[model samples]
Target: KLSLQDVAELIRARACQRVVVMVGAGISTPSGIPDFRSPGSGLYSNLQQYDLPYPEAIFELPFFFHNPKPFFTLAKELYPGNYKPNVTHYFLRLLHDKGLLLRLYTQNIDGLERVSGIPASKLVEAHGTFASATCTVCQRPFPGEDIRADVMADRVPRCPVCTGVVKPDIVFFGEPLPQRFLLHVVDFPMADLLLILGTSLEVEPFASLTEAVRSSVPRLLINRDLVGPLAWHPRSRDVAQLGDVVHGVESLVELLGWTEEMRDLVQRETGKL
Candidate 1:
């Protein structure tokens, strides 16, 4: 847990370069967004109270096909809540400006990170975001807001060409994890820093990525709660693994880190993450 003052100084002091930011709901909550898993505030804070046909079914493909109303209900709440990017996002952008941001990996659906003005090259929308919507059947992607009109009016977002339902490729319960997510996690250790931001670090495979770094590097965790094994710099010639964990991909490493080391930028052009 870093003090607000130290956190502020940390970015300016360096020690974080080649940073790989991993973000989650905590980062976007400032934007008035809901976290599906946290109690009282998230969608799953109380399962018995909501009484869904099944837990977290609103995002699942089958449940939506059966009844899109539940999802729409959530969407209604989410639509107007589409703001409030925290100082966290702005801070990341500052890092980018200083040429220290390596990459940002986020697991939120809100488009706040981009809204804060971080370039597309510095980001990876890990979870399917409100940024775009695509037809599940045809796999055609479209601007998210373009479908907002239809989504607001109809239960299902229909494709203009095939009438197939448009889904915002979020990781629905039954669907596989985002493909681009895997590639980055597998190789992030090569980065000088891995910052884990505002997430519980409970979910699989992803939760484990923190362990891949070498002992010489540092891991920084910026969140309301603590969740990862401490970060370290692993020793190996020809394979230098160093990193840090902060709340988002936003931080400046004046002397300790570099931005060129992250991988998210290499693929955002392809829309993989």
Candidate 2:
């Protein structure tokens, strides 16, 4: 059986360059954000108070078009400024700082990766984010700040130009993912290593990325449960470190001899926020 230490050694020896990291909501759970499908604690389960046609309906495009109140109400609680990046996010930055990061593709809309100091060029928010907004009709852009007060007050913002509803750029159900995802999907096969972090791998197009990497490239899964085809079907180059994301990442930092560096980074970065 391959161990996490073996994975770290592989990274330090042969897979240091061109690391592609894919992250999900599990990484942000430590920062108090609930993941989407984690039994009773998941966001979908806890959203009973929203009284929707269904829990996921809050994120459905058609649902938003008819009644946007639920989405914006949830948005006020989930907006970016409320959360801080945890160790796993800083670990992504550490990979970048060491010149090993190729790109980071995240399934989260929380915008924590940018807050954790990963550069915009190397990051892809596949589901889009609240960093920007646009009119549902004309598609004219609005700064996220322009609608912040309305969102915070659970009031939907209307487009000043066409009187259409304005929504954050977050990809709702029935909406296509960002073009950047397609643009960067080609980068996966070029990776020397693939780090799959803190995701259930239930969401598609995003989850399908596991199959994009070259079979020869090593994949390391640091998550609370077994997920994705890579995790289900064992390969010689695959390593599964199943547990809490923070603890798993901390172990990798130690195994890779980056403990002090990671500690310094966490202290400095978290202090700044």
**C-alpha local distance difference test of each model:** 0.61, 0.84
Query: What pairs collide in candidate 2?
Result: none
The TM-score values for the models, in the order shown, are 0.72, 0.91
lDDT of 2 by residue, 192-272 (tens): 888999988988877888888888887889999888787667678788888988999999999999998998999999998
Instruction: Report the lDDT tens digits of candidate 1 across residue range 1-273.
Output: 333344335555765557777777776766567665556764454343544766577777777777666675666455523454555666666567677787888877777777666776677766656667778678898987777876667556788889887766566775676666665754476666666667777776667777766665556666665554442322231121122323233333313243443333323422332
Which candidate has the top score in TM-score? 2
Worst 10-residue stretch by lDDT in candidate 2?
35-44
181 Cα displacement, candidate 1 (Å): 1.1
